[PDB]
């Protein structure tokens, strides 16, 4: 009956409300995806329960145990009925789960502490270290690129010691902030743009996006919800709600 | 034409109509994914991102 | 659409230009009739091409 929604504590998509300990259920959270979940649920006619993914990961298949972790795993093993999060539509995921059309368009980008202007720049040097989220579509983009500059970047990143990979986006952001310009972070343009509008306003997005892709609402392969969820995403985009929500969470409340 | 539904006859024209009435098996073109179309035909994930814009003479 | 606009902007007589930002954000998709045997495979093929970098390659080829 009640749809279990798996999501991730990733700002500004889902965050704990300042007074969450005094609130119950869905009311404990706020964010772009919290606002989107309420709307998808109204338009699809279902009751839901927001739950934060237990391992705090997006979703990758372990080469070895072949088990899917993160939000993708929760859907694959039936622990959740739908994922409403900044989950990237990728070929490997689409093979095991269904995705609505994109609710947000984006691409990999470079985040620097306020002398690097591009991925080519990062590749040609070694003083400034750089990495990605330890588990996610960004790390996979590099591990599989056949493009020279990106393959060179991957060769470096995968062998860098200490590790240049981070467990969460917040961790990558803090590393950039505390490294005196000696660490650049590769992350999705959406997260980059958000952080650029957050105090202490010491980071910046540089260069163009490395690729073009989108985030989609995910459901277990063959779910009853897929069709309606997809139609809802298309309707909300055409009406302008998605743009409204991005403005609300990225720029209207910007601190810089 | 790309494809729109006649308000009167409810008949689809353009590439959309060709798919709807079985004249073509697939449309590979700059065909925009929309709610009205998604109701009558299937669309793959996007191969290109875009938005409406304004073209002016310099 | 921004796509046609920016293409024309880079073609003689070079007398037009795109002004302002896009009014919305959407995408183009390969379409098939409802229940088509091709639907599933074409969708996965689009995802493969984007990830291989082929779509960006074709875009630069025909625009830039
Ligand atoms: N949305 C990404 C997670 N992730 O966020 C980034 O900024 N990079 C990255 O891999 C995914 O779905 O795997």
Curated annotation (Swiss-Prot), chain A:
Function: Ionotropic glutamate receptor that functions as a ligand-gated cation channel, gated by L-glutamate and glutamatergic agonists such as alpha-amino-3-hydroxy-5-methyl-4-isoxazolepropionic acid (AMPA), quisqualic acid, and kainic acid. L-glutamate acts as an excitatory neurotransmitter at many synapses in the central nervous system and plays an important role in fast excitatory synaptic transmission.
Binding site for L-glutamate: 86, 88, 93, 137-138, 188
Name used for this protein in its record: Glutamate receptor 2
Sites marked Interaction with the cone snail toxin Con-ikot-ikot: 61, 143, 235
Outcome when changing residue 237 to D: Increases rate of desensitization
Topological domains annotated Extracellular: 115-256
More details: The postsynaptic actions of L-glutamate are mediated by a variety of receptors that are named according to their selective agonists. This receptor binds AMPA (quisqualate) > L-glutamate > kainate.
Assembly description: Homotetramer or heterotetramer of pore-forming glutamate receptor subunits. Tetramers may be formed by the dimerization of dimers. May interact with MPP4. Forms a ternary complex with GRIP1 and CSPG4. Interacts with ATAD1 in an ATP-dependent manner. ATAD1-catalyzed ATP hydrolysis disrupts binding to ATAD1 and to GRIP1 and leads to AMPAR complex disassembly. Interacts with GRIP2. Interacts with GRIP1. Interacts with NSF via its C-terminus. Interacts with CACNG2, PICK1 and GRIP2. Interacts with GRIA1 and SYNDIG1. Part of a complex containing GRIA2, NSF and NAPA and/or NAPB.
Residues bearing the modification Phosphoserine: 145, 179
Result when mutating residue 91 to Y: Promotes dimerization. Strongly reduced desensitization
Organism of origin: Rattus norvegicus (Rat)
Positions of the record's site feature: Crucial to convey clamshell closure to channel opening: 116
From Swiss-Prot, chain B:
Tissues with expression: Detected in forebrain. Detected in dendrites of neuronal cells. Expressed in the pyramidal cell layers of CA1 and CA3 and in the granule cell layer of the dentate gyrus.
Subcellular location: Cell membrane; Postsynaptic cell membrane; Postsynaptic density membrane
Induction conditions: Down-regulated in the pyramidal cell layer of CA1 in the hippocampus by global ischemia.
Function, in words: Ionotropic glutamate receptor that functions as a ligand-gated cation channel, gated by L-glutamate and glutamatergic agonists such as alpha-amino-3-hydroxy-5-methyl-4-isoxazolepropionic acid (AMPA), quisqualic acid, and kainic acid. L-glutamate acts as an excitatory neurotransmitter at many synapses in the central nervous system and plays an important role in fast excitatory synaptic transmission.
Protein family per UniProt: Belongs to the glutamate-gated ion channel (TC 1.A.10.1) family. GRIA2 subfamily.
Domain notes: The M4 transmembrane segment mediates tetramerization and is required for cell surface expression.
Identification of the protein by name: Glutamate receptor 2
Taxonomic lineage: Eukaryota, Metazoa, Chordata, Craniata, Vertebrata
Range within the parent protein: 470 to 527 of 883
């Amino acid at each position: 009956k009640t749809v279990v929604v798996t999501t991730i504590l990733e700002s500004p998509y889902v965050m704990m409300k300042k007074n969450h300990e005094m609130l119950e259920g869905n009311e404990r959270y706020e964010g772009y995806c919290v606002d989107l979940a309420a709307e998808i649920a109204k338009h699809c006619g279902f009751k839901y329960k927001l739950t934060i993914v237990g391992d705090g990961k997006y979703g990758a298949r372990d080469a070895d145990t072949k088990i899917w972790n993160g939000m993708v795993g929760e859907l694959v093993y039936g622990k959740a009925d739908i994922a409403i999060a900044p989950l990237t539509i990728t070929l490997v995921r689409e093979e095991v789960i269904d995705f609505s059309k994109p609710f947000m368009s984006l691409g990999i980008s470079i985040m620097i502490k306020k002398p690097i202007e591009s991925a080519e720049d990062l590749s040609k040097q070694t003083e400034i270290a750089y990495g990605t989220l330890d588990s996610g579509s960004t790390k996979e983009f590099f591990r599989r690129s056949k493009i020279a500059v990106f393959d060179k970047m991957w060769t470096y990143m995968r062998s860098a010691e200490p590790s240049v990979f981070v467990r969460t986006t917040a961790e990558g952001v803090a590393r950039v902030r505390k490294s005196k310009g000696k660490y650049a972070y590769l992350l999705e343009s959406t997260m980059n743009e958000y952080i650029e509008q957050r105090k202490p306003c010491d980071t910046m997005k540089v260069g163009g996006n490395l690729d073009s892709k989108g985030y989609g609402i995910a459901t277990p392969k063959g779910s009853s919800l897929g069709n309606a969820v997809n139609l809802a995403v298309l309707k909300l985009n055409e009406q302008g709600l998605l743009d409204k929500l991005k403005n609300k969470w990225w720029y209207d409340k910007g601190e810089c």
